[PDB]
Structure 1
């Protein structure tokens, strides 16, 4: 990654064995559960495009997801090229060439070039741009590998309401939807799919009851 030294300068640092192992292990243990994505984002904090490719390439197996990831990356890279055409011309001494989509993705750019873009003033955050593409692709993989639909999450006749809300928002989280969609799904299904006894208790709370009040009422 690119870290700041004690001279105020942003300096490249080697990816650590702790970071490499942590990412490999979380993929082995959790596959593509929704919480793997924020773990990837945090483990790739300050990462260069080279570091991001390293984390993706160190993953063994799951090559169907990795190949889908590469397709999303190429779609986003092509869009960047459509929006930012490179202007031919010799590069100035203190300047850097404008990055292509494949340069942001680390496939046609060197580490030195990525350091140059990231440590420029103003910086071109090719690592954060690339990470935005990878997470976009990881969101589709999580959504695709989600086994259960939110419509099929219904509270059992003897299931505690706490456990049913756990399954509800776990299934809802694997959708990788916006907060507006999450709130629309909550107002459409959480109360309506509760079991008969708890549903009656929740209807009498009104639409303005908080989840804390809802879980308390069906305790």
Structure 2
């Protein structure tokens, strides 16, 4: 990575053996899940592609999911060269040569070169871009690794509505639905697979049930006894 210490210029130095040991531990414990992913961003700060390959190469678990992540990388990069032209003139004074997708995976680029792009001013953000495409590569596994579908959701026989709204959102964390499909899921599919008596309170909102309306709903008399007031 790239680091600042007590120096005058940025220091290019390798990833820590401590940070790779912490990395494999979360992967042994947790596989790939949506909690893994901001764990991932925080240890890949100021990454070169060489630091990212080192994380990918240290993993010895999940061998089949990892080959699907490299097929996803090959695809985002392949989209990267089509969407942003790679024909150019000659390289002007002051400037460095320009990344294309195999440069962003670091397959064509070398280490001194990759570092040299990200210490340039404004930086050319070769690790940042490659990090984003591997979060997408994570997202594809994390989606398959989930223990249940979003479409099979329904409320526990005595589950509070609040805790089911919560659970439904938690299963919805890595889920790549559009804003209107996410709203139809919340206002239809969630409600429709609810308790009948909470469904009937919620019925009387009409069109456009909010999150603030959902939370405040179903607070009635009867049912379960209250928790004591001196705890």
TM class, shorter-length: 0.7 to 0.9
Within 1, Cα distance between the matches of 2:46 and 2:40?
Answer: 12
Distance 1:174 1:95, change over 3 A: closer
In the alignment, structure 1 segments of 5+ residues that lack a partner are none
The answer to whether the 8 Å contact 2:46/2:127 transfers is yes
C-alpha deviations, 1:67-112, integer Å up to 9, x for none? 0010111112223333455558886785432223222112222211
Bigger radius of gyration: 2
Structure 1, residues 143-170: CA drift from partner, whole Å, max 9, x if none? 2233322221111222222332232112
Scaled by the length of structure 2, what TM-score is found?
Answer: 0.81
Using the alignment, how far apart are the partners of 1:78 and 1:208 within structure 2? 41
Gap change, CA 1:56 and 1:177, over 3 Å in 2: farther
CA distance in 2, matches of 1:58, 1:179: 37
Judged with a 3 Å threshold, the aligned counterparts in structure 2 of structure 1 residues 110 and 200 are, in CA distance, closer, same or farther, namely: same
Aligned length: 219
- d(CA) in 1 for partners of 2:195, 2:96: 62
User: In the alignment, which residue of structure 1 is the partner of 2:177?
Assistant: 177
Q: Does 1:122 align with 2:107?
A: no
1:2/1:201 CA distance change after superposition, 3 Å: same
Is contact 1:117-1:126 (8 Å) kept?
A: yes
Which whole-Å CA distance do the structure 1 matches of 2:87 and 2:66 have between them? Answer: 32
Q: Specify the alignment match of 1:165 in structure 2.
A: 165
TM-score by length of 1: 0.85
Cα distance, 1:206–1:23 mapped onto 2, change above 3 Å? farther
